[model samples]
Target chain A: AEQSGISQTVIVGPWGAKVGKAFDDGAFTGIREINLSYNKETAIGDLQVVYDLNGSPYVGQNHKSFITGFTPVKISLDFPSEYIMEVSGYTGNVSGYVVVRSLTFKTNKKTYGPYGVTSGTPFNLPIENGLIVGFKGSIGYWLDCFSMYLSL
Target chain B: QSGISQTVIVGPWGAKVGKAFDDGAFTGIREINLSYNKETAIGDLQVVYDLNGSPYVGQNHKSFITGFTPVKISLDFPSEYIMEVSGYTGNVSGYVVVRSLTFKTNKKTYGPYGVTSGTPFNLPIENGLIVGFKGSIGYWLDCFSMYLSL
Candidate 1:
């Protein structure tokens, strides 16, 4: 499929539902903007972008999305440090591949984490990089426990 | 009024003297000097002469004697005594008289006279016979006697 000029980016979920829409399972849509910029060197003038909403997007808000012209250019996205960006295209026939790039934003020389790992145990990961898979899993469990036991 | 004859001898006895005589058979007068041994402790010894047979004698053959030796009384006497003394036995039937017995003493040997003995004497009175005056009133004399004209 040949590309044309860029269209306005809209984020939808698995049920073809837009942000702020309630699903049949009673979960409201929460996809917000994932910051997307491109390297001008390889950017094309027409690109179709869609983000999947399996759960919530990075900075989950209804009006936030990332869209750009088609080009062989790399686009940078910043979300909540913990997010997955599903970049795809729609060129009249759903032709581009869904590249699920884990949205990671590097801080300056000052970095924090691999936090979120339980203390007193050796963290089998790099120190200054953001949360890893194990840290994410442990922190998710800790948050679940905290919500269950402590929160009303 | 007949003629009188008597022998009179004078000499010192033991610390004093003694005499005797007779009269009519011996009707003369004799003067006897009585002497006392010096350094004797006879204190105010009295002497009396009595005419044993003379009925008209006034207080017997009268005399009083003292100070044969220098008198050493601690103080003055009210009156001096008079007496007669003869050394040997004689018929002296006449009266005797003792005029005086003048006493001379070591001035410093005793305390002052006419005041109490051992009293503070008149400090500045010339010829006063006290050794030293020690009491408060006596010291007052030092102000006038020694210190004033200086």
Candidate 2:
């Protein structure tokens, strides 16, 4: 049984068609890597996570939309020693649909990105004594919605 | 919580020419890729490292020698790590560079690739695992070094 010290933020954005149930990567020991796929000229396409399952690394399902010409922007974390402290991004209309436009992850050691084009309504979620553990949102032609999971 | 050690770096053997490069340190590593050719020394190198479970592809350090025949050294993370790296460095087309190399892991050994007839450099770690790499690169891998987590 996985004990809980984890909490989630309100889902960001209201543009995608399908509202997804909060997807959890379960109780992970730490995060190993994260990939944000985007088109640069379009909206952010997906969020993929790989987390540490005790000593072994586990790959989570892709939280994505239409996987078009999405080039992946990757971040490799030094876990336990270094973890995500905050996540910030922009949300805007792409092809008449509201979607996540860009994202940046702030960790203990360094900041990973602000991947995708930065335009529209921007949102910044800075956690107090928190580590980004997983993600959840709605999906469409791009990352239609976005939210974060944090473990304290 | 897992306890880790301080990082230590070893020799970057060969001539002191070319631009310096350091891959820095990572909590975990996924793969080490090297590229070389028939007429030159090791021409390029890249490392795909892991953070948590995500894969981060480091920048490729290229000597830009022609006809690259690439090779990959993959590790079974958490269970396997690089324990040693041994290589030879010598002159190729009037330029001193990393000639041949070998990788020793906790589980297996990966080669003595290229010609082994030059100055030798060997890093055999005792209580630590290799976390990153450093060296110089011009038209070939001019020098090579390792970062150790002990």
Candidate 3:
């Protein structure tokens, strides 16, 4: 009988997530990626737009929408242990004057964003201690896309 | 009419293979993310292993690599736009054993040692451009199970 394992390391399974469970499983070692889009449904799920601004940014007027859709979209983050989510936004000429719009992301204890939702500038938030995850508001230009990035 | 134009928004364009290109064609606000998994080809990928505390080496080990195959688990990135490449030594107690692990981006790197048993770690990379990775391991193939998030 030889050794049955490496000096270091353990094994686990995928689909490691329960559909309706909170992030209490807490012991998985792999990571999950959630991509949101205006065109497709990501792995974790699709987005729900609770509030649509109902206007177009391309038009030379003041508004918070697109030829495609509006905002007030809600997102979700499914994971275990500690992970970080990178939030991003899209911006440009939306209506008359500088469409002064920014986004706000709030968890159980903290809030992030209001950064230029259009730049390469991203918000990296650490997920821990059982917190609620999602965002609020749109750049009035558009909500291009955001990522639910996890690392364990 | 003072003006009329469609705000620029670049959607995602993903595929298999490892390649690099400018996104100037995309206007407006944009988000670029390239996803690579076992089911399909990944992106402009490359990896290396560290030696001593400094000297790092890669596929060149083939001169001494025998009986074993090159570390090519996600071995099928088969294109210039995206790729899956890594290196290894042997296999025992079965499966790949990815030892002494760390992250790799623009060669700057981060992360740790769990890529051993087909564990896929997704890292955020922008048009970080033609970036590659470097680390050490057991098993010859199934060496690195990684996903590129652009």
* Chain B vs. true chain B: TM-score per candidate: 0.16, 0.87, 0.24
Give residue A118's error in model 1 in angstroms: 8.4
DockQ per model, Cα: 0.00, 0.02, 0.01
* DockQ score, prediction 2: 0.02
For residues B1-150, could you state the per-residue lDDT of candidate 1 as single tens digits? 458432211111111112332222111112112233232211122212222322222112212433334333332211221111111111122211111222233232321111111101011111111111010111010110000000
> Candidate 1 chain A: minimum summed lDDT over ten consecutive residues — where?
A143-152
TM-score of chain A of each: 0.17, 0.79, 0.25
Error of model 1, residue B118, in angstroms: 99
lDDT of 3 at A80: 38
Residue-level lDDT of model 1, residues A24-82, one tens digit each, is 11122222232222222221122112232444432222211134332232323243343
Local accuracy by lDDT, each model? 0.19, 0.70, 0.25
Model 3 per-residue lDDT tens digits across residues B94-140? 43332222334332332232223232222233221222222222222
- On residues B45-136, what C-alpha lDDT tens digit does candidate 2 reach at each position? 89987643567787888764467788998888767777778888888888888888888877899987777877888877666566667888
Tens-place lDDT per residue, model 2, A1-152, is: 01111111223333233333334343344588887788889888777788764345768787766557888787888866777777788888787777788888887789887899888888888767545555667666787775554443
Q: Which should have the higher lDDT, number 1 or number 3?
A: 3
Clashes of each: 16, 8, 20
Model 3 agreement with the true structure over A40-143: per-residue lDDT tens digits: 21111123322111221111112233334332333332333333332223222322222222334443333444433332222222222122222222222233
Total colliding residue pairs, candidate 2: 8
Candidate 3 off by > 4 Å: A1-82, A85-152, B1-65, B69-79, B83-93, B97-130, B139-142, B145-150
